[PDB]
Write an enzyme that holds these catalytic residues in place. Structure first.
Site, PDB file in Angstrom:
ATOM      1  NE  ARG A  64     -26.358   5.328   5.554  1.00 55.38           N
ATOM      2  CZ  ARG A  64     -27.420   5.910   5.012  1.00 55.38           C
ATOM      3  NH1 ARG A  64     -27.264   6.929   4.172  1.00 55.38           N
ATOM      4  NH2 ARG A  64     -28.638   5.466   5.299  1.00 55.38           N
TER       5      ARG A  64
ATOM      6  CG  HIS B  23     -13.596   9.540   3.307  1.00 58.92           C
ATOM      7  ND1 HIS B  23     -14.892   9.199   3.631  1.00 58.92           N
ATOM      8  CD2 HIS B  23     -13.227   8.707   2.302  1.00 58.92           C
ATOM      9  CE1 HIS B  23     -15.285   8.196   2.864  1.00 58.92           C
ATOM     10  NE2 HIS B  23     -14.294   7.880   2.048  1.00 58.92           N
TER      11      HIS B  23
ATOM     12  NE  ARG C  25      -2.690   2.910   2.949  1.00 59.11           N
ATOM     13  CZ  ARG C  25      -2.108   3.997   3.456  1.00 59.11           C
ATOM     14  NH1 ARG C  25      -0.879   3.928   3.955  1.00 59.11           N
ATOM     15  NH2 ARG C  25      -2.766   5.154   3.479  1.00 59.11           N
TER      16      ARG C  25
ATOM     17  CG  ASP D 141     -17.924   9.289   5.768  1.00 60.85           C
ATOM     18  OD1 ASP D 141     -18.457   8.308   5.192  1.00 60.85           O
ATOM     19  OD2 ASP D 141     -16.684   9.422   5.878  1.00 60.85           O
TER      20      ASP D 141
END
Lengths: 310, 310, 309, 309
Positions: free
Chosen positions: B148, B172, B85, B145
């Site tokens: 929601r 986020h 990653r 976010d």
């Protein structure tokens, strides 16, 4: 998705146009004693529908309100010489006495949407006349005032109005109360917000926001005789809210049990507007100063609907 | 009204879709190194337009971004076998260093809309690389976010989510800060409005909802590979506000001079979003635990960026 | 205003999205055997909603199709190592299960067939449903007719919505672009082009023919499949069905006779409303476009007959 | 995306209203000599806009028309001592001063004529503009065409969108109807009728004819004039212009030759674009329809040059 409008004058026809253009309802029914007039507005608006959304706009009698989920009462007006002001109200209340029960005979399960001025006292008139729960009779109230309050603030702060969470309370008349203390843009208090944005709301340029919200209605009347296009779209929005069971929050007028100590008066307040009319009332944080403007307003209104005996 | 999207992946092309079905902008140019992947998504979306609003949706090069008033950056090279990653992250930022100066040459006036993940570190990567003013590079940040969050509160409070004025700040991601303390509905403290409805909102109810917005993006991933439809639409809505000079507040990620003692960091705050990107940023009222959670988030993010070279 | 969609794959889910962004349906139920897949797409499309219109998108079982007024059929299966026309046998195998179970829950619903190939699959759904033929409807040739009018509107400098020309038959190679009865402004097409300083040489006609036929090709190659397109047009067909539009679309549905060919599902201009297709509008073909459609019908029929339909 | 409306009458303001609720335009400027009346309409409409789309609505001088792609010309009322002449006399003395004053500010604008007798006033606008004849556009018979379709649609049980029929000529008593070149879904009307069962009777046609012609009758009876319907019709043309739609609408515009009548303006099916009408289409006709058109046309020419145009 059916909506009735009793009173086929400028306000009611504008509303019908607004409903039909915004494609909110699938059927608007205009009802006026001037069945000829009712019919012209309806057929005129209908001819618009091909160039907007397909909505069946038509004129009728009370019997064709059957099934309407909300019925807009915009059926006042009269002569204006000559006669006084409490005398025009006296004869408009007479009309509600004539129109209310008849509308309930056809659409008992409907939400009553009062739009005859004085909005608040007429709302009061309609509630007691209707014999319904208090949340079913709903007046236009300070929804156009709240929007102007937001519009002026949104201009001053250089932001979008939908992002200015502030309200106008109580009377839709020269006694409304602008909420400043609890107002809010972006999670910060409104008076506080307007400092980082380098533009403090001085008591001066913030008392002119007041007599700009209070005077908006008049510049029109004095300029073209009546006010219609604005309250028409606002009504159509409230009707959309009721039809879709959206439960939005609007500063609309409705019978209130207790508010600032004044009992049994109808005035605007942040209400949750759903398919059963108001489903809940919200009581915003009020600075000790504004609370005074509320009761003073809430007392004017109450002692108004008493001369009328309501 | 012309819109560019760099990176025709799912998120890339779904943003083109939502843009076209919502009929937000009149012209949408899709740019990708895979010239045929851009040319394929754009051909598909165009076949959709005769059943919606008319949009000229095409696949081009950087020069075809000419006069785009907004370009959405959603690159993201695809991870390689044997690449960590950490390596992929450094590698993605090198695609940004190629992308950014090239788009800004075609559309020197475009507002940059950062989509790629991680969106806060990639928003900082774009800002450093643009040499543009800080408000000219916006990243999607916490929109979904905050949506929601408002939605779960709405389901819970039986109120329209548009009426729930609550924000989600910071990363986020897993260190996002649900700010409960300044949240309002109808001008009343979210927490206090909870008794003005269904008897209250417990610190368990509160934790349940937190998990609700946090675990949200992953259930989709651990079901179909990636999330893109929700983002796509959300993205498309910011570009609306940008195109239309809306000046409305969204919780979007942008580069911030200082947050809780942490300097020069990109995270989401409620910001005024308009024709020139963020045009103001609101620093919303915060409680001790919230201030701290924001700081832990602000520093987590600063370090990420700082290690990367930005 | 409820809509079902069986098959939360790329076509089915694109359809759900398109429905949400367009705000037709109030409720959209995705049904797929990969429950997590349906879950994922639904949840994803849910999050899209606060940025368009309120429509509850969810995932459920055939049960939750109760009261749906249309159920899109976009089921299908994995291509599987070395197979071909027996992927086609296996898909009809799926409808055999899908169709009764969809009508068991929503018996009044219009079925919208999407699983490719639309025509042959529309045939098998019809023959499975036991319904009147108008209630089983194929996505058909709507994208092509749309694209026919599209390119036509470029080469004519007019508005797509003002070019009334249709594509018929198969949604595929044997499709018929109907050039004869094609009209714009009421007046005949090639006349109008010859009065706009824009006469269509046959090479122009060919260019646009290829543009309609190989549009599947070009997308398919550079991306894999098509879905964003079909999804919106399916969404629009659901719009008509929910709203009792009685609008004219070139959809696929079971035809008793087409140019002497018996019992074949192909596309014709049809009247779509709350009961499915409720009328056929059969346009003046040329002698050349008629024998064309015959072969189209001929091909589709053998296709279906080979499958056992 | 700026629209100007000269004449803040009922039609003027109903159009502003429709524009703003349909989100056609980002800015609408109301221009009227009764500055305080134009201002009162602007503010009333503005207050509507929170409950629909962000549109800036304000009243202003002609100078505030700058950079507007469409100006709507809607002045006068419809009853003063003499009916065509006068007002039509006194209204073209208003167009006499309004038209050049308007282009002095918005010289790149398309003039949309809303003032009655619309076909003649459009000629007046055209002659006064010194512009290409396509850039002055009369509202014409857009509402009559609509009403023609909404009736055929009602009868044939199809979507109005799918009834491709027109209403040509002078907007008024003598408005010829294209009964013969009317199609539906390609196929021509009378044939499509036998199909849907509802075969289209002679007595049937009559009823719908009067239905179109007497369309405003009840409105005018009820209130003296129409404005809601045409306001939306105008708003729809403004959108076509603002978007370069190039759709087809039956609108009035200076035509060099119609049916043998030299230099005259009347409604015909036109391609309306960013720069006004950019094409015209002769639909097929009949010996009856043709003569109908012709005398209707030269009525207008012997009204126009019967006034100097």
């Amino acid at each position: 998705m059916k909506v009735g409008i009793v009173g086929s004058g400028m306000v009611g026809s504008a509303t019908a146009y607004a409903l039909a253009l915004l494609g909110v309802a699938r059927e608007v029914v205009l009802v006026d004693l001037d069945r000829k007039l009712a019919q012209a507005h309806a057929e005129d608006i209908l001819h618009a529908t091909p160039f907007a959304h397909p909505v069946w706009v038509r004129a009728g009698s009370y019997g064709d309100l059957e099934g309407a989920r909300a019925v807009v009462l915009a059926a006042g007006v009269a002569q204006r010489p000559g006669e006084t002001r409490l005398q025009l109200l006296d004869r408009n209340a007479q009309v509600f006495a004539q129109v209310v029960p008849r509308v309930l005979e056809a659409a008992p399960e409907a939400v009553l949407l009062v739009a005859t001025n004085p909005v608040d006292v007429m709302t009061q008139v309609a509630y007691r006349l209707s014999g319904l729960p208090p949340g079913r009779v709903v007046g236009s109230g300070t929804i156009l005032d709240t929007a102007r309050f937001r519009a002026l603030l949104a201009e001053y702060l250089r932001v979008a109005p939908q992002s200015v969470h502030a309200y106008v309370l109580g009377e839709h008349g020269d006694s409304e109360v602008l909420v400043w203390s609890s107002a809010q843009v972006g999670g910060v208090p409104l008076l506080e917000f307007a400092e980082a944005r380098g533009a403090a709301l001085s008591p001066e340029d913030r008392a002119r926001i007041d007599e700009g919200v209070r005077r908006a209605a008049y510049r029109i009347i004095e300029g073209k005789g009546a006010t219609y296009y604005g309250i028409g779209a606002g009504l159509a929005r409230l009707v959309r809210a009721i039809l879709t069971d959206e439960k939005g929050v609007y500063t609309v007028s409705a019978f209130t049990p207790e508010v600032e100590g004044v009992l049994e008066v109808s005035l605007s307040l942040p209400r949750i507007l759903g398919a059963g009319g108001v489903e809940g009332t919200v009581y915003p944080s009020l600075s000790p100063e504004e609370r005074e403007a509320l009761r003073r307003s809430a007392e004017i209104l109450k002692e108004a609907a008493f001369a009328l005996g309501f």
